[PDB]
Design a binder for this molecule. Structure first.
Ligand SMILES: [Mg+2]
Ligand SMILES: [Mg+2]
Ligand SMILES: [Mg+2]
Ligand SMILES: [Mg+2]
Ligand SMILES: [Mg+2]
Ligand SMILES: [Mg+2]
Ligand SMILES: [Mg+2]
Ligand SMILES: [Mg+2]
Ligand SMILES: [Mg+2]
Ligand SMILES: [Mg+2]
Ligand SMILES: [Mg+2]
Ligand SMILES: [Mg+2]
Ligand SMILES: [Mg+2]
Ligand SMILES: [Mg+2]
Ligand SMILES: [Mg+2]
Ligand SMILES: [Mg+2]
Ligand SMILES: [Mg+2]
Ligand SMILES: [Mg+2]
Ligand SMILES: [Mg+2]
Ligand SMILES: [Mg+2]
Ligand SMILES: [Mg+2]
Ligand SMILES: [Mg+2]
Ligand SMILES: [Mg+2]
Ligand SMILES: [Mg+2]
Ligand SMILES: [Mg+2]
Ligand SMILES: [Mg+2]
Ligand SMILES: [Mg+2]
Ligand SMILES: [Mg+2]
Ligand SMILES: [Mg+2]
Ligand SMILES: [Mg+2]
Ligand SMILES: [Mg+2]
Ligand SMILES: [Mg+2]
Ligand SMILES: [Mg+2]
Ligand SMILES: [Mg+2]
Ligand SMILES: [Mg+2]
Ligand SMILES: [Mg+2]
Ligand SMILES: [Mg+2]
Ligand SMILES: [Mg+2]
Ligand SMILES: [Mg+2]
Ligand SMILES: [Mg+2]
Ligand SMILES: [Mg+2]
Ligand SMILES: [Mg+2]
Ligand SMILES: [Mg+2]
Ligand SMILES: [Mg+2]
Ligand SMILES: [Mg+2]
Ligand SMILES: [Mg+2]
Ligand SMILES: [Mg+2]
Ligand SMILES: [Mg+2]
Ligand SMILES: [Mg+2]
Ligand SMILES: [Mg+2]
Ligand SMILES: [Mg+2]
Ligand SMILES: [Mg+2]
Ligand SMILES: [Mg+2]
Ligand SMILES: [Mg+2]
Ligand SMILES: [Mg+2]
Ligand SMILES: [Mg+2]
Lengths: 258, 158, 134
RNA sequence: CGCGACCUCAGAUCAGACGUGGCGACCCGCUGAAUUUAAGCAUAUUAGUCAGCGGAGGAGAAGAAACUAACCAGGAUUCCCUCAGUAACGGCGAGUGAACAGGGAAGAGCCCAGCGCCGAAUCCCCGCCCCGCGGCGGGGCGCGGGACAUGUGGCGUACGGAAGACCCGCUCCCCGGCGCCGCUCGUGGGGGGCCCAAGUCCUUCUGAUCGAGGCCCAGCCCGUGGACGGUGUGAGGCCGGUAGCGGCCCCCGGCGCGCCGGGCCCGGGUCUUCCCGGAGUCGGGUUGCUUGGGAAUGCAGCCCAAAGCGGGUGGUAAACUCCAUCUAAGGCUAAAUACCGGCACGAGACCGAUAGUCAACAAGUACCGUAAGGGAAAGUUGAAAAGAACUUUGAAGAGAGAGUUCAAGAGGGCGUGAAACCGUUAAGAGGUAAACGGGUGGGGUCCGCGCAGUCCGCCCGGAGGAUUCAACCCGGCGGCGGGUCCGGCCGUGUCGGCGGCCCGGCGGAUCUUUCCCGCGCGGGGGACCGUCCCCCGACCGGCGACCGGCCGCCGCCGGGCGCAUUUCCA
RNA sequence: ACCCACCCGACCCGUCUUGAAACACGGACCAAGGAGUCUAACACGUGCGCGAGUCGGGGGCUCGCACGAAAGCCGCCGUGGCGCAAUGAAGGUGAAGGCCGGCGCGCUCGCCGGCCGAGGUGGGAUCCCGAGGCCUCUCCAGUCCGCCGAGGGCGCACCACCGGCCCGUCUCGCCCGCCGCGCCGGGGAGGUGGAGCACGAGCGCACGUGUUAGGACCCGAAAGAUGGUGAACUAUGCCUGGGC
RNA sequence: CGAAAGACUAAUCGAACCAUCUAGUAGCUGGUUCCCUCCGAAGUUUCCCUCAGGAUAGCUGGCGCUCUCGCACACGCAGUUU
RNA sequence: CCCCGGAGCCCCGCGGACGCUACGCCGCGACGAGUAGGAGGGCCGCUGCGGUGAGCCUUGAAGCCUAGGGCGCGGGCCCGGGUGGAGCCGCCGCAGGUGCAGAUCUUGGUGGUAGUAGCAAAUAUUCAAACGAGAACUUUGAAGGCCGAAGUGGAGAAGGGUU
RNA sequence: CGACUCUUAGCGGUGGAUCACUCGGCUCGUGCGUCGAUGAAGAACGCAGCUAGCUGCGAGAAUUAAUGUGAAUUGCAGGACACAUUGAUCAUCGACACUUCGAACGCACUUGCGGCCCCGGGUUCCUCCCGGGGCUACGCCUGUCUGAGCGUCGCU
């Protein structure tokens, strides 16, 4: 809010003794606004309580190493179709979920080419859905240039723009990310981890260089490895009915004395 | 009031700080602006190093920084004299000259000299007209490069 | 999307720019399309409509095939009045119902030197687009 | 008793110039509180801050050391990070509070006075001619005037300079014009103009559709264009736009070439001989302010008042003594930096008419106050005025009909139309004010039934009808699972190849300059070590990491199986 | 859930208050608005990333920013902060000890070789060993699997305690060192001060709660300051007219 | 300004009015906005230009941690008593 | 002295819920006053952003009304009918100018008071006629009255600003 | 049953909450970064066929010219124009124009007095009279002219 807001009067509070209510009141006149109360956050006119400042701490910051961890997590659950399906991405007829395309796609220069590529990969249903989602936003956003809203559709991770990003552009839903410049906000929208992705061989081969194996640095991000896992065999069903564990357990008391 | 254990602390919010708070919503813009102007300085000074002028090796002062080495303001007069450069010309071939620098130690003196010797070597002085006189370098080293040097010229490695 | 950073997308700023647009700009705004017979011939999509271009209404109540002559354009009100597109008041006197150029279609232009040249411009810059795309 | 020089000083509606006020976000120069805090209060603090006055510019101010340091030393100002909430100050309380060094943005340096040399070599102004002329300029020519020796101009200024001899090497820089060529980064600099994709397709709701269903591949078309807005609802494809190293037209800049007119005979080193610096300024006292600056950080008034191997500084006063380090008392300087005022743009996790600016509207308006000054309220018919013709009652306001509208249960302060409050209609009640908690009962209101609700679902038995199969084999397809790990792909741990090692890269304070290249160092080889890859054999976890056969089992399709089977139906 | 009936119960809320139905204050009614915020700084807790590190700023490199004033990257990656060292006003100093064998007279002192290498006591989650059983359809033999385990061990973390080390200081002592033999330098033993050491736990971000500094939960003085506007009323002086 | 009453100075006077410093300061009055669940006080300590306020302990809550054994196989602790 | 792809089962070690959102589900006990104050959980609630419901909406969104039907201990919510006429919501996260009975609170609106208090300073009105929809009040005539030339008469200054 | 009162609902009012709109704000950012004696800012008074205010303009007064645009403006009138023509209307804006106060400038603030040059009527330069035009501020700079002084000197 403006600093001034509310202090553009000369309101002296009438003292006590004139009945009334000890607010600062608009000095003088034969206007309507003539002893109406001012300043106080209760008062019409008045001044909002603890006004908003610019120097509120809007921006926040995050360790580099975490951001990277985040982006890994995200890329990992771009695989794992369950998650991607749970994030909604209609990915039923897609062929192999780290979904990589020849790099003639790098240099398409027309939408039509792009759209036909999606239909051949069977991603087109995601778009189809994006289209369908396109509907009006509810509330004051409307009056603030956030009037239409829709899904997020497939990402397309390209190694270099040889045209491509022009081709996939009007197709609603789609994003493009350079690999060498990934982004969480787009890989994991809403901070929801699954995302349907379409990689391009060149980009996809560049991942191991960008983030490293476990037994090699990034070799591109200075000094960086992928994170470690805290428990290896995530699938504990297999663990629990292993030999070695179920050998050594007391037997299950499961009768119920009521 | 204080309340049981924790830094007594004097914070300086007694004058009208709110009148004079400085917010950094500029910054990004300003990173952009400066950069543009930077790029435009390069494109102006076509083949000259964008960096600017060659600057000399120099030790920092004080028992602390002592051991580290920096860039200087410009090469001192002894150092030009010895390398065989006229002081008013040095400004014109991309050589920073400060004149206020004393030169105490013979070692630094010869280091900087060795820079200027090095520099003049790896310099591609264009001629005044396209019609070539002396000094101005050969049409070979001119066609093969009217090329800049991005980054400080002869970078000062400690 | 748009990309040009000197243009708006800004409900309010567009609307002001439309509602407080001046007449020579409202010429461009109150443009209407050419029926497919003309569209073929002149190789033009659309033309700023004018005082006596014959016209078919396409949408609304008056929606029909009845090729009326435009009577008058009321650029103040963004609206054109058309030969027989009218309704009786309570006292009998007829009144032209305002139709909005975009829900109309031009069936016969009122060609003069200037208009002819415009359609010659639009064809030209179209075919340059087609030659560039080829 | 004149005339003449100059000097100091007047007057002019003398000729031509210029300053005057404003705006004031940012900047510079003064001036300068008190609320406040210290739980009182006086120094301190608030604060060199508000208010006051002055003066600026697109920036200002600053700035080319009388600097820092004390190091192996750095090298104008500004700005950011850091230093540092530190050194320091402070009723050593509350509170205050920098600086160098280090890393960054940017980066640019200079000119006088003096000391000297040059016939004043300089300047301003008048008048004629040629060019040029909307930022009054160039060339020529005048015994045309003045300024100037009480000192103009070139050279030169502390980084040293001047003048001499002979060592060397050689001779392009500027401006006033006039042309002409390449339209010169948001990917054609700036401004302006005008143009450029694709459905109103088929049914169907609707008052009206931009809706809904469909359209040779989610359907047709475009899509470097699916931003936005408009259009009788919700629109990529109706219109404007949007996109695009897209088009044309103007106008303007900026740089490239040519010609003319002028100016301009403009170096460096080496040895000799000369030359060298800002006074009521420094410095001391002092008082007052000021500072973090503490026996005085700065700035002042007054008194005193210098020097030249001097002068200043060297964060504890003073003397002696070495070192260091600058050169004060004259001046100019872009650049990073600032910007709640202005012109013009974009954007927002902001506000949504008691909000948001006082102000969405004829608002700094109405109105108030003598005046300074104060200072509101106030948005919304409908898609379209189609804003209710006409009859009728009434002096009219008002109605009654009629009509427009999808709607006037939208009728010109008219969207929605809450509550408080009132009028009426209906129902119920009524001497302990009303209202309330718990417990029932009576009545009302609607809701659910039932014109049996006897509610379903298995399995079974029986009596009636019903088609086709289960069971069984045969053919095909698919799935699961499995071991012989059988054959092959696949990968973990180990061992063998020292095999990738140079046909495997990176790293290393491991070495070697026997190497190479560039100048004891830099780069590249070359060794060494660490780390990552090929080849086969063997053992083992045979791991959801897969194929192929084979086996076993499941399911599906199609054959046959005609009725003690098989489902259906009652 | 609407009305009505009756029995029983039943004082009007808000607030300060030892005590409110009060002859305490606020409140006729209704609508909308209306009060613990934000920045900074600490503290402790908690979540994440990394770990003797950590760190991002500030800057820079990548684009006309549609989304980007983002995101990514940097021998700047670390100038620098904070941490890895303390103590003393300062000059300054600055965290190890043991054993064994030998040489100096083992002198609980001085100098030379070898081995171990953060000390010890009590308690300590946990781990390890485990006599022994307890059966098996027979009499014994007898490997395998357990169940428990009397008893004994290594013992995290933390606590109590003892020694030990560094800095300051005292006491008392006797030796050693050299380019400078000195108002030099270095040690020892014993007390005592320290926000110490004694095989590291920090850094970055986020959330919370607390405590301040800020308008600082909202509203409230009497005052204080700066700079202006008024003598049309009124107070007095003067000028020029009127009146009784 | 006052033949003086602290009178008068534009309904204002023991210091006019207007605007700004200013959202001045307040140990003092007043208010301080949804539900359930759980635990649940103090009005005493010492110091205070302290006595309508703070500090400090006390009382409250929250967060935990280290251990303990009803898993036939327990040590410590108490508004008691002997 | 035999195998569960079959002992037939009160126990089954061959495979295992109808059950198992392991932030789930199940079983035993004991317990339950609360200002100031603290803490927990809210599938309580309000506005906006990232995600997400192939969500809802002119065949009717929001809002408003409701002697309709229900849920929830509650905060609150879901349904039915009406009105209205354009937008809105569930879930997972993020953000906050997020919940009112009071503050002699601010603004606006409304009651009771109440058809009440009041329309009582300066002696005074009456008769006829006109106009007119309409006359206690307008105008005309008559009568009775007053101000009583220091005026309720005629004229100016200041002030007003078209009266 | 009656009147009144209270309660509830239905319909009417009262009032304008709610919701939904938004040519307005508020915030952050970018680029320029320009006033004035050649009369600024601001003030006043004027100007439309019908116009009060707002806005826009200056006695050429809702605007002239010029360029670009290419048929309107529109509340009603009335008109023009040949929209095969410098051409409606818009926009731009380079030319032209810009009443009175105001730093405000002849002196005064009454709109009150003036001075001096030039023109037309008025004369027949006869001054008057009227009307018009141009000058008439302060401070300051360079030059010019005219001067001042028992200021310092020179020759007579
Ligand atoms: Mg407000
Ligand atoms: Mg809403
Ligand atoms: Mg640089
Ligand atoms: Mg005080
Ligand atoms: Mg106090
Ligand atoms: Mg006091
Ligand atoms: Mg001060
Ligand atoms: Mg000021
Ligand atoms: Mg000025
Ligand atoms: Mg300057
Ligand atoms: Mg200087
Ligand atoms: Mg620090
Ligand atoms: Mg201070
Ligand atoms: Mg000279
Ligand atoms: Mg189009
Ligand atoms: Mg629309
Ligand atoms: Mg659209
Ligand atoms: Mg002071
Ligand atoms: Mg000293
Ligand atoms: Mg200067
Ligand atoms: Mg409003
Ligand atoms: Mg309103
Ligand atoms: Mg308002
Ligand atoms: Mg509203
Ligand atoms: Mg409307
Ligand atoms: Mg309304
Ligand atoms: Mg309706
Ligand atoms: Mg309506
Ligand atoms: Mg209405
Ligand atoms: Mg009623
Ligand atoms: Mg009744
Ligand atoms: Mg009491
Ligand atoms: Mg009582
Ligand atoms: Mg009270
Ligand atoms: Mg009361
Ligand atoms: Mg409210
Ligand atoms: Mg923590
Ligand atoms: Mg604390
Ligand atoms: Mg307050
Ligand atoms: Mg606070
Ligand atoms: Mg106050
Ligand atoms: Mg005082
Ligand atoms: Mg008190
Ligand atoms: Mg508890
Ligand atoms: Mg309890
Ligand atoms: Mg009290
Ligand atoms: Mg309880
Ligand atoms: Mg509408
Ligand atoms: Mg908000
Ligand atoms: Mg209320
Ligand atoms: Mg009465
Ligand atoms: Mg009388
Ligand atoms: Mg009279
Ligand atoms: Mg009279
Ligand atoms: Mg309204
Ligand atoms: Mg209103």
């Amino acid at each position: 809010v403006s600093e001034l807001a509310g202090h553009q009067t000369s309101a002296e509070s009438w003292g006590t003794g004139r009945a009334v209510a000890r607010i600062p009141r608009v000095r003088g006149g034969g206007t309507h606004r003539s002893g109406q109360g001012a300043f106080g956050n209760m008062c019409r006119g008045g001044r909002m309580f603890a006004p908003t400042k610019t120097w509120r701490r809007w921006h926040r910051r995050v360790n580099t190493t975490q951001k990277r961890y985040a982006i890994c997590s995200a890329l990992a659950a771009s695989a794992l179709p369950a998650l991607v399906m749970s994030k909604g991405h209609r990915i039923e007829e897609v062929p192999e979920l780290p979904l990589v395309v020849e790099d003639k796609v790098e240099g398409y220069k027309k939408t039509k080419e792009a759209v036909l590529l999606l239909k051949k990969l069977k991603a087109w249903n995601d778009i189809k859905k994006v289209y369908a989602s396109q509907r009006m936003r509810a509330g004051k956003g409307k009056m603030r240039n956030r009037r239409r809203i829709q899904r997020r559709g497939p990402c397309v991770i390209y190694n270099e723009d040889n045209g491509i990003v022009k081709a996939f552009r009007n197709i609603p839903g789609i994003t493009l990310l350079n690999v060498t410049k990934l982004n969480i906000l787009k890989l994991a929208p809403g901070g929801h981890v699954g995302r349907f992705c379409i990689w391009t061989e060149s980009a996809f081969r560049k991942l191991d260089d960008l983030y490293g194996t476990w037994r090699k640095a990034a070799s591109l991000k200075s000094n960086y490895n992928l994170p470690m896992h805290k428990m290896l065999n995530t699938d504990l069903s297999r663990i629990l009915k292993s030999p070695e564990i179920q050998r050594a357990l007391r037997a299950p008391r499961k009768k119920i004395h009521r | 009031a204080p309340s049981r254990n924790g830094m007594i602390l004097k914070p300086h919010f007694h004058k009208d700080w709110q009148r004079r708070v400085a917010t950094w919503f500029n910054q990004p813009a300003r990173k952009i602006r400066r950069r543009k102007a930077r790029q435009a300085r390069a494109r102006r000074i076509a083949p000259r190093p964008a960096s600017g002028p060659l600057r000399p090796i120099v030790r920092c002062p004080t028992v602390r920084y002592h051991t580290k080495v920096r860039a200087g303001r410009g090469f001192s007069l002894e150092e030009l004299r010895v390398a065989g450069i006229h002081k008013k010309v040095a400004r014109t071939i991309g050589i920073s000259v400060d004149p206020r620098r004393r030169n105490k130690s013979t070692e630094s003196l010869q280091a900087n000299v060795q820079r200027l010797k090095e520099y003049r070597s790896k310099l591609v002085l264009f001629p005044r007209k396209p019609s070539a006189p002396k000094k101005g370098d050969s049409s070979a080293e001119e066609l093969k490069l009217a090329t800049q040097l991005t980054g400080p010229v002869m970078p000062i490695r400690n | 999307m748009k990309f040009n950073p000197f243009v708006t997308s800004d409900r309010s700023k567009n609307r002001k720019r439309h509602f407080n647009a001046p007449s020579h700009i409202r010429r461009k705004i109150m443009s209407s399309p050419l029926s497919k017979e003309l569209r073929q011939k002149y190789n033009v999509r659309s033309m700023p409509i004018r005082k006596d271009d014959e016209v078919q209404v396409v949408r609304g109540h008056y929606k029909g095939q009845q090729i009326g002559k435009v009577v008058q354009v009321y650029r103040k009100k963004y609206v054109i009045y058309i030969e027989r597109v009218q309704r009786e008041k309570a006292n009998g006197t007829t009144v032209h119902v305002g139709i909005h150029p975009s829900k109309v279609v031009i069936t016969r232009l009122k060609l003069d030197k200037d208009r002819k040249k415009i359609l010659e411009r639009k064809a030209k810059s179209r075919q340059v687009g087609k030659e560039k795309g080829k």
